[PDB]
Amino acid sequence: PIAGISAGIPSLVNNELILHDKATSVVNYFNHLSESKEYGPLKTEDDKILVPIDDLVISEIDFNNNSIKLGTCNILAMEGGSGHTVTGNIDHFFSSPYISSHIPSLSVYSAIGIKTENLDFSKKIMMLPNAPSRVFWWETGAVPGLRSLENNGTKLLDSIRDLYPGKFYWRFYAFFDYAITTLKPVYEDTNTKIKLDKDTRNFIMPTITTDEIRNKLSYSFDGAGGTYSLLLSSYPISMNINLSKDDLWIFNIDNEVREISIENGTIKKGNLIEDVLSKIDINKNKLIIGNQTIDFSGDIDNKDRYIFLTCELDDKISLIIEINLVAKSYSLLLSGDKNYLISNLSNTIEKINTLGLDSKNIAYNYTDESNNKYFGAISKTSQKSIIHYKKDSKNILEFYNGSTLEFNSKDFIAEDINVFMKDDINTITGKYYVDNNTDKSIDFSISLVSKNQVKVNGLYL
């Protein structure tokens, strides 16, 4: 679900953001931000992912210590009210306490009771926090007949009122039934420090519709030794990736390259945006892809660094943009089943052309379920392709033109096979053995051209 579905998406009323307008909508917001005393900061969804409580600000996610730290769901306070009494969880007053932004604010992350330390980050798929630091100007209207509402939200509000015995009377009786009516938040700039561990972690970037929320929230992942991924959202969020030593970074750009549609509070990916990846900023310090600017600060001097951007072209074909930041270069990989890829290679090529990638050649590094490794290459123009693999200690190479197999050697008798394509021409360099004689070794570089025709580019004796 898109950000703000469970809690609320603020709307720009007059010139200020208001997420909840009703008295019972505010209590529902507190009820939603009261699950953390029962589900914790992270709740397990689909048995495969961890998602934080929506609109719950998280400032630190320490994977190494299995600990979390929260930001500031800070809400304003009051001062006033003579002859205060409490009867039946109802605050009877003689005066009318008033909101004040000129006094110390009251934090809900002291009465909510967050289990910050020693959490279970076992599941390797996680969703990033969708809440920056927030300050709540709340206005107490005169809504009548709410002195019977018993949710988790009213429990949280009572806990906040109890924890501050002088301020924050959420619902009171100023001779009339008064209760919280509005929640108007402002968002201080927030940077979330996620300290990566040595394991493999996968992150989901939340999609926040409100630009005022998105522009005031930032991510910062401290690198370590491992492989980490990230599902880029179509609504960009500023991030600071701390490049560690020998780490693998994956940025799933599925949402950043497909037409995003929001319905039922859920994201649906449509067609690919034309020329979305036509120009990629691959500066060695930061990467701007189509609208997302990932900031890489740290071991940015590594000349052997490789980041990967993954987009699912089809249900089976996966496109992997392998980028080197120090060289500011990128290349394309087209994984997936070789039979399926060859059957509809034209659709994949036109999809890539729609994406706008100008890489004239694409690599292929399939690894099937039964550990069969199909390597090869595809020419973006002329749609030629070479697929080399091994099956039962036998070397098989297949040269397809467009979608038709124009060459197939099912037993390629040669060691140290290595294939590469110049533009459209293809060459295989290997070490044939004359009459199965290890002493009689001939190195070859050959080009496959149509049926039963091979162009010998070079020989070494």
Added chain:
Amino acid sequence: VTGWQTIDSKKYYFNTNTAEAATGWQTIDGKKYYFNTNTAEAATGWQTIDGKKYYFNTNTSIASTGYTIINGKYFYFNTDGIMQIGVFKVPNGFEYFAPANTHNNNIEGQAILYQNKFLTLNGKKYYFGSDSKAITGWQTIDGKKYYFNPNNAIAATHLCTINNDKYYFSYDGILQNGYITIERNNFYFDANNESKMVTGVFKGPNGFEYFAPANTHNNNIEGQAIVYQNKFLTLNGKKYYFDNDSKAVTGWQTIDSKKYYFNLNTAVAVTGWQTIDGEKYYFNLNTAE
């Protein structure tokens, strides 16, 4: 045997062209025939399919009716045919269908004799009395003033427009009467005529205020309290004058160098012969003073 077979004690059906017994879901005659996975067993009355429960007509035919009588059991089928557990309208009223373990150890979907009690599914409030059907309208359970929408029997629980007669209902649904705050605007829903949205001047938390009609001050709302910066108004029959702020005054006051009075209980212009702790002063019939 393309199409309809001879039942063969199992109500067998075959493809028109493929001549295959298409197990699964099939839309014969624009219907929802489910053919069992065994071979083609088709309708077996009760049929739980991927959690969804369907009851099938034993005498072949179709199973998507709603308000169906089966050996004393009344069940509701939606457009696709899945069994529901909500409160749905039959031509005899809004009947409630309950799980198995609710009353009399029934079967899931029975029209339970639920009466003289409240009920909810997801915060949607219904009430039942006498017959086990909704009494949508204005209801006075225990002296309250609930309103159930005739369209869906769901109790209104917010600002609801009924006959151009906007009312305020709390989260429970009870009609709230008096000074209310909708969004950031202030409204009065007076209880004298059973809680209509009034556009007069009535008592508030900080004095009498002018709940003006539409467009009386800026682009306000009907019945919305407005700021009335020391002005003069007279809606009909009674003159009204407030303080510098929008709040009114109920005492001896002067406006145009003329002594004035307003009733202690209500801030209404004092007109006609009215003795106030002494001389009557002959408060004039018009522009009293």
